[PDB]
Every structure is written in structure tokens, then in C-alpha cells.
Amino acid sequence: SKVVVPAQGKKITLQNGKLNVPENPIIPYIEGDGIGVDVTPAMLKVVDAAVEKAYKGERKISWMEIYTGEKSTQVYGQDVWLPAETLDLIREYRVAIKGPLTTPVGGGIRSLNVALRQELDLYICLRPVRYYQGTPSPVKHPELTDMVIFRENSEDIYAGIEWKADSADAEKVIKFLREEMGVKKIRFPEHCGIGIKPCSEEGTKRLVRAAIEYAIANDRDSVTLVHKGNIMKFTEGAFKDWGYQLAREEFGGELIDGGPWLKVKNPNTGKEIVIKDVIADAFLQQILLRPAEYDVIACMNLNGDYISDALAAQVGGIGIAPGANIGDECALFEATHGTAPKYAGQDKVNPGSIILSAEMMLRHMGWTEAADLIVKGMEGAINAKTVTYDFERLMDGAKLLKCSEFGDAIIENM
Amino acid sequence: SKVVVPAQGKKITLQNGKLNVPENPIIPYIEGDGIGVDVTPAMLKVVDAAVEKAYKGERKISWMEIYTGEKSTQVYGQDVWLPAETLDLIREYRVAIKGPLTTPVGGGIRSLNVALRQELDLYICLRPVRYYQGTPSPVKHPELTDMVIFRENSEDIYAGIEWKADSADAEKVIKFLREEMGVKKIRFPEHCGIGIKPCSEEGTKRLVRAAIEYAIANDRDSVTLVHKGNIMKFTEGAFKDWGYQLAREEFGGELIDGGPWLKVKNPNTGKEIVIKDVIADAFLQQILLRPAEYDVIACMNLNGDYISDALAAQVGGIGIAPGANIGDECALFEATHGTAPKYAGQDKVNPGSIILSAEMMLRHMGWTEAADLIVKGMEGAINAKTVTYDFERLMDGAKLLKCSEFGDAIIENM
């Protein structure tokens, strides 16, 4: 209604579990608030150059701007932070990409990023982190990290089910818990905020299924379920048990030794994938002390959030980390950093996160050649030490480029 | 009843908020399971040598063995994992120290470490992590880390309030949430485990009060409240607000700029302590990229658990990290690693964690001189590269010592 659909261009189609991508597909993109205004132009330009180069003019993306966040209020009026038609158009066109998003405080509005994930049921938050050679790192051996995070997006304490301390609601559920359920374990029931943490069998088996499938499809070496199940036995501990059950039941997993670990034989390469688990606080230690031991990671919402952020900091990628939210019906790729408003408009932040999320978008579309050209350009620009301000402070002998110029340096190294 | 109280020795007394420690105090110690049998002898020997050396024979600790874990079942019978009299004797003698503890699976027994914390109301889990010069680290600059963690021990998702998927209880509380509370946000209400996360005003203000007091008493530079309050507004977000409120209300904090940060003037040194906050997933990134910016940390149960484990791994201290659980009436110091049963009895693991928890025990007793002699010995032994197997693998040119021998190397460097 305020989105103008491209006169040239055709919709991507879902023909039962498989995307049928035209040569001129319409992709919705949400520009983003703050530095979204800088990074999103850089990404439309390097993706267009990559499909122009890979398919020699045969394929072209028809970009369609849709709205969410601060820009949606400037287009539809001060009150609409998430238009109902963004949800519809992402549902419809099947794959979209977005920049960083401002959620307001003061108006009872919960996280717009989490709102897109939950409203469209994009239950997989897929976070690849690997080291790009030559980026400045805080750790001695960042090249040892090559992990892919499958983070559950629809349950956990992130579902936003909670009531304020002293609210009627809170008093009511605390009354129910003490009187009807007989819980004598809340230390101070007065002036007490309550949050609910749900974890279901359908919710964890659909994420774990995707993670092992990823491992079979890319011959990864192992799937690690991370959980804090020694203290949270019926949510986090249920996650690890339903995860192992699904690897036994659906993937024909077998005990290594006398357990608990399983082996899944990859029906294509013949190799064995280890399904193992590790407690989430020892895992935060293990990614720093033995990163080469881990590969594909499956975990719940909160932990997945912490794990990816922590891993992206050790490889030097806080600003170049890609991300996707995938459901059965559509996928939304995204810059995983913030709106950074101090820099907005100055053309200086790193466009690397949304550009590498656009390669994940291309790869997902089946446009592998265009997608390999972007990570080829990326490696080259960083190796050329022809870099953005955030990488040049930490590097000696680098050449400082603006946001837009690092975009052309990715195209030059293609 | 099976503990034999020392014929020489006198009880420590609490004479309103202040410990009155005799020259020959009786300290309860729980040996611990697994490698507890190796580390706890090393710690009784280096602590005795440190008080012998510091006070030239005037003071002496009367050690009294009490029981919890696997050894309690061998003393009181197969079913008693936590005797009621351990709780009483730690209450009574005021300060105790313990080794690693085995909680059994199969018998519905929740975490014995968490059980001591909650049953004795030791609401502060105090975790100091600093770098000891010359220990092998995974990061380029471990010397930049010097933080003290104040982790809330009595609330959060760690209170163990939860019900299994498909249990009558679970069905009942999910029914209450959907019908009586009108929650339409649980994605899959069938086959769903539910955990409760409580956060009260009394529960967070008593931890934050201790953390700022620590900062005033040791002239630390700042207190950082870390929380995941953008998604969990009424528990984690209530934590940050009640934390700032208590710094305004009780410590006379003032806005820096137009907020949100506060300044508290230290009434002894005149210096300003910054009370600031940072979201918990960006904080896991910040301790690796800018560790010198942070000092005293206050946080809730789960986050505190993750933060300390992560910080102890980057300074090379997964096996030398000290810890305490402090309440208003008693304190329990502890090895913060596991029972490690494969090595148990072999005299090879690092006794550094329980020894440095014993210096925190000594310091807490007011026996500062004996406590400085232990960290003097520690620095010396590690600097002499006269070290235990876990540090020698990662070091070149080290001399390998057994557990007991690293204990004598701490005494030699005293």
C-alpha cells in the first residue's frame, strides 16, 4: 500500500519445500534504522555487482523496499512500528533482507527483531562464524574457529511472557504458584517480577532436525547440543534429551562407548557425525580453549544469543557477522549489529554484516556463484588491509575506507 | 553426630555484623568428591603453613571435617547426600570451606552446591578473577582483566521451579496461563516443560548493595549491572532499575551527562565510582575486546554463572578460580571446578582453586597477612614455572609437579 512493487520482476515460489527462483526475482529489503541508511546501499551495490558478474547479465534482482522500525513511522504515521503488510509481503515474496532495527522504549513495545521472528514463525536463527584471514582478533588463534549456530527462535524466556512486580497479574500468578502449586521456593514473593520459560518437544525437535540436516548436507563433523540442563532439568535438560532422541529415532544414531554420545552416518559421504552435548557454562569456556573440537551447535534461544555474540567477538567479527531467520515458509536475512545512531549518515561503519547475510541469502536462493564471489571479494578486501575504521584502529599499515568504498573494494577483489 | 568437634579450638562469633575470630578458630571443611581427596589435603597444608609463618605460632586453625556428597553417603548411609547437621554446623561455626561436590542423577536430587546456597541463604556468589602472571592464556592480553563478580545466588531460573512436559502439574500451570492469564504466546502448549524465573526488589537490592560496598571498601573504579533487560523487561530489566535506584537512594548517586550512568563518591578516597549497565550479550563481547573498562560486576544467577566461567577461561584460570557464597549469617568458600573423577586419587590436578578460596576465607576472617602470603606463594610458584600438569602442557620449559608438590612450591615461595 505504500510499497511500490517492481514492474519488472517475478515472485519466488515455494513448490513444496523447494524454492523456485526466477531470473529476475523481487526481493523485499528493509533498509533499517541508524546506520542501515549507510550499510544497506553498500549491500545493494555489491550484490548487484556479484550477480552481474556471475551470470553475465542473465539474472537481476528487483529490489522492493518494505518498512519496519523508525522509517515505518515516517511512512505510515507515528504509531506503526510494524505494518501488517510487512509480515504479508515477507510471507509472499519468500526471502527478504533487513538492516539494523530501532525498538522504542516508553510505549510498551517489545523487540521488533524478535517480533518478526515470532510472527512469521522463523524458528531457526542461523549464525555462521568463521575467521576471515587478516581481521584483528583478541585471541591468539582465531583461525581455529569455524562453527555454525542453530539457535531456536520461538520458545525460551524470549517468548516475552512476564509480569511486573506488584502488578495484579504478577500477584495472581505468584498466588497460583504458592497456593495451587505449592511452591515454597520463591525467596521474596512480594515486589517480584515473574518470567515464564517454555521448552516443547515439537519446538526442540524441529530445530535439531535442521541442525543435523545441515551437518549432513555440508559434511560437518559434529553436532553439539548445548544446554544448562543440570539446573534446568525440564526445559534445557528436556532439550538435550529430545535432541539425542531425534538423532536416534530419525537419523539412526548409535552409542559411541557406553554413551552419551551418538554417531550418525552421513548417508552421502559415509563419514560419522558425533552428536554430543556440553553444559552451557563449560561451553563458553571450551570455545576459547578448544575451538577446533566444535562445529555445528544446536541450542535454545537465550543461550544461542550469548554463544553467537561471544564467538563473533573472538574471531574479530562483531561487525561482520551474518545471520538468518528461517522458517518453513520464508526467510529473513539480517545485519546482526545495532543501529549505531552516532555514526548514522556518516558513511563510516562496516557494511560487512549485512553483505555476508546477503551472501547467505544468495546461497539460500541457489545462487551459489554470486554468493562465492562476495566471500571472495570480502577475503580480498580484508587481506588487502583496505578496510573500514573499526578494523583499521586495530591494524597496522591499513588504508582507511568509508562504508561505501569498502563496498567497491569488495567488488574490486571479485 | 558423626562429626568430631576439635577439643582445642573455639567457635567464631557474629557480634552484630562483625566476625569475632579467636586465635584457634574451628573451621568446618567438606573434603569433596573426586579430586577433592587430592586438593583438600594440599589446601590444609598450605593454609597451616601460611598461618604458622604469618603469626609465628600464635594462631592455629582447628580443622573440623563435615560431610556432603558422595562421602556423606559412606558415613551416614546411602540415602543422605546432605545431612541436616552440615547446614547447622556451617550456620554455627560461621565460615567453612569445601571441595568439588557430586550431585547424583536418577534420584530426583537437585544440585547439592545450589542446595547449600539456598538452604543457608548465601545470596552472594563472589567470584574474583584476575590474571596471575605467567599462566598460559588463550588471549593476547589477559593481564588487562581484573574484575570481581557479584552474582545473585537466591532467585532467577536457578530457584529450580519447574515442571516436566506432559506432567499433570505442567498441564495445570499451562492451563492457568492460557485460560486465566490469557497468554497466547506459548508456541506449542502440548509436550512442553515450564520453568519459572523470579526476580524481586529485596533480592536484587541486597546483592547490589554488597557490590557497591565492595567497591567503596576497595576503591574499585566502577560497578556494572549486567542484564538481558531488552527482552526480559520485568525480571532482568527490573534488576537494572532497582540497581540504579539503590545507587541513587542509598549511595547518593548522581547523573553523569543525561544518564543513564551514575557517579557515587567514595566517602573514604574521594574518587568517583561509575554505576553503569550493559546488556549481557554485548558484555560477553566487551570482556574480550575492552576488559580494562570493567571492574566490579553485579548480575543475576544464570548470567553471573556464565560471565564468571567465561572470564576464568580467558585469564587461564579455569582450574585456579576462587569462589565464595556469603550470607548475613555465614560464608562457604569453595573449589569452583568439578570433581574430575578420572584423576581422583592420582595426585595430579591443580589445587589452585581451593587454595585461592582459602585465601579469600582467611581475608574474610581478618587474617590478611596469612592470606597475602598465599597469593605471594601462588605468584611465585607459577612464575617459577613449577607447575601442575594442566599448566605445563601449555607452557614451554616448565617443571611438572604433582598436586601435593605444587602445594609445597606455594609454601617455598612464601
Curated annotation (Swiss-Prot), chains A, B:
Domain of life according to the entry: Bacteria
Phosphoserine carried by residues: 111
EC number(s) given by UniProt: 1.1.1.42
List of residues binding NADP(+): 102, 337-343, 350, 389, 393
CC cofactor note: Binds 1 Mg(2+) or Mn(2+) ion per subunit. Both Mn(2+) and Mg(2+) can be used, but Mn(2+) is 10-fold more effective than Mg(2+) in vitro at the same concentration.
Effect of pH on activity: Optimum pH is 7-9. Exhibits maximum stability at pH 6.
Residues binding Mn(2+): 305, 309
Family matches, as InterPro entries: IsoCit/isopropylmalate_DH_CS, Isocitrate_DH_NADP_dimer_prok, IsoPropMal-DH-like_dom
Residues noted as binding D-threo-isocitrate in the record, renumbered to the chain: 111, 113, 117, 127, 151
Keyword Lipid metabolism appears in the UniProt entry: no
Family the UniProt entry places it in: Belongs to the isocitrate and isopropylmalate dehydrogenases family.
Name under which the protein is recorded: Isocitrate dehydrogenase [NADP]
Annotated gene: icd
